[PDB]
Amino acid sequence: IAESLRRLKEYVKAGSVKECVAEWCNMPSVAGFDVLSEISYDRMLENCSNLLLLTFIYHISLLDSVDDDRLSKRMEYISRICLNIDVNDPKVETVVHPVLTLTREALLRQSEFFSPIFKRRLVVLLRALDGKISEI
Numbered sequence: 762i763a764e765s766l767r768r769l770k771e772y773v774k775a776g777s778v779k780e781c782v783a784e785w786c787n788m789p790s791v792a793g794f795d796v797l798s799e800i801s802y803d804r805m806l807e808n809c810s811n812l813l814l815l816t817f818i819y820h821i822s823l824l825d826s827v828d829d830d831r832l833s834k835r836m837e838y839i840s841r842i843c844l845n846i847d848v849n850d851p852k853v854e855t856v857v858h859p860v861l862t863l864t865r866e867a868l869l870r871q872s873e874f875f876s877p878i879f880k881r882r883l884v885v886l887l888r889a890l891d892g893k894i895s896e897i
Contacts, residue, residue, distance in 0.1 A: 762790045762792065785817075
């Protein structure tokens, strides 16, 4: 964890966005997520491949923290990426359906422990994920 945090911190400073996301996905710690969270989702969309973006939301869905502020960031990243992602990109055709399915299931598995604010926010997020699965 500690070696990885050091790399993440330096990638954020340099503005190495893809590198930040890829580093965190390889070592998806809570502390690392908090460093990465300095990078807004729009920068991620400009710099990361669709495969990497799907790797990222999958890892966010598994992260074992339900703290309100952290969960807010978790859900915002997932929402924005899933609304932006082109589910018809051939490069992700063999992963996009199972990844969206696993992402939804992962969030539901944690949902009993979400505060009421985020139980309600999840209903909205699930609708967005289901809409993307509906396209394909």
